[PDB]
Point group: C3
């Protein structure tokens, strides 16, 4: 009945430890139930003239579980409306990283600068399993 | 023997409900067996001068299963040949979305405009599981 | 005790067959334990003036398992420092592909050209499961 009970269908759902390096920002959350991503905030004010990029602090650190990856995606609304993107998209956040998550925002508009404010939602963070593959070198795919 | 039988190795393979909002376009399909993506069509004719972007209608809506994500990726051929990309790539399609899938195409060529026609394959849609992570705020990764 | 023993927690970890088409380059490896990606090398020297793109040979071919996808992501360091990106990111490598992996590098800097050398780490390759979804066409999401 209350939300502290893990419902049967979410028994196996994983936890992500997070430190709010900038406690002034809300915890990242999912916009709606079942949303793939939790939105990351900007800790900072930044203006991007057309074509410029910035490495923007999000004020969070996370501990992606071993066997998993964090993935930093552009929001579609800002992408379409003003041409905001992420140079290294999808940003790859490794299980072992304990640093601050940073977003390499870029202005892909021709002519209009983008102003981002501290407390704006600038990206989305997903968490997926990844295959930590063992390479097997072969001389031909025949043999494999 | 016939294709209506789910082969043992595909017993668990998931279904994706789709509505062809624009019934004039073929259903998205995989180019070859085991292909990660089904190709999305453009419902529309659009010309992108260098550096410009457009939000292009695909004529489909989908129901990504709960626990899953739809992911909209650029095709590599158009990317290399004419510099076509997707501003918000990888496009994030949430389980709860029942709208039309739209592709934010962008011309990354310097000098040559891209012409897209209705019925062109402009992107690829993948479907993956996602971890709907429960955030656990900690003051340090020690504690976690 | 020795590394030839598959530790219990990695019993199920998957193998990826690889051919070094250019045996002069090291095998792709993970920068640290639990890293999502193995770094791909450039087989070639290439200079990208601002805004230009190139399809760069990596000197490898791989056999992504059936049920899986290879994903080619930008490195964040080069993305931020010099504006290097990948036009079709995330590059989609299909299970059935046995060709050379190629990286569609692009210079997103305004003004400074990027020089890549043979033996530079230019991208990262991830491997994930993918849902080879069966489309089910419906006239409305009601019915589904
Ligand atoms: O390439 C895309 C990406 C998203 N979408 C749709 C589906 C997705 O569930 C919805 C929201 O995507 P984002 O969360 O990336 N956009 P934004 O964060 O700007 O809007 P919202 O506040 O709706 O989450 O937009 C597309 O049609 N095409
Ligand atoms: O970054 C990439 C992406 C793809 N590829 C190769 C492997 C992949 O299986 C193949 C096809 O990729 P796309 O489906 O993204 N390209 P496209 O749709 O233009 O061609 P096709 O008609 O072959 O699917 O191209 C690369 O070598 N590097
Ligand atoms: O969008 C990003 C991407 C990465 N990162 C951090 C987390 C990740 O684990 C770390 C390394 O990312 P890359 O491997 O993509 N960068 P690079 O290969 O340049 O550096 P390294 O040599 O550290 O792997 O950088 C971010 O903070 N934001
Ligand atoms: Mg959103
Ligand atoms: Mg294709
Ligand atoms: Mg790296």
């Amino acid at each position: 009945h209350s939300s502290g009970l893990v419902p049967r269908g979410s028994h196996m759902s994983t936890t992500l430890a997070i430190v709010r390096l900038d406690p002034g920002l809300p915890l990242p959350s999912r916009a709606h139930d079942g949303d793939a991503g939790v939105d990351l905030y900007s800790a900072e004010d930044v203006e991007l003239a057309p074509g410029r990029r910035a490495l923007v602090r999000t004020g969070v650190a996370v501990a992606v579980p071993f066997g998993m990856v964090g993935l930093v995606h552009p929001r579609s609304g800002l992408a379409t409306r003003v041409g905001l993107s992420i140079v290294n998209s999808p940003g790859t956040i490794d299980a072992g990283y304990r640093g601050e998550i940073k977003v390499a925002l870029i202005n892909l508009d021709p002519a209009a600068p983008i102003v981002v404010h501290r407390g704006d939602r600038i990206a989305q963070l997903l968490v997926q399993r990844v295959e930590l593959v063992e390479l097997v070198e072969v001389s031909s795919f025949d043999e494999a």
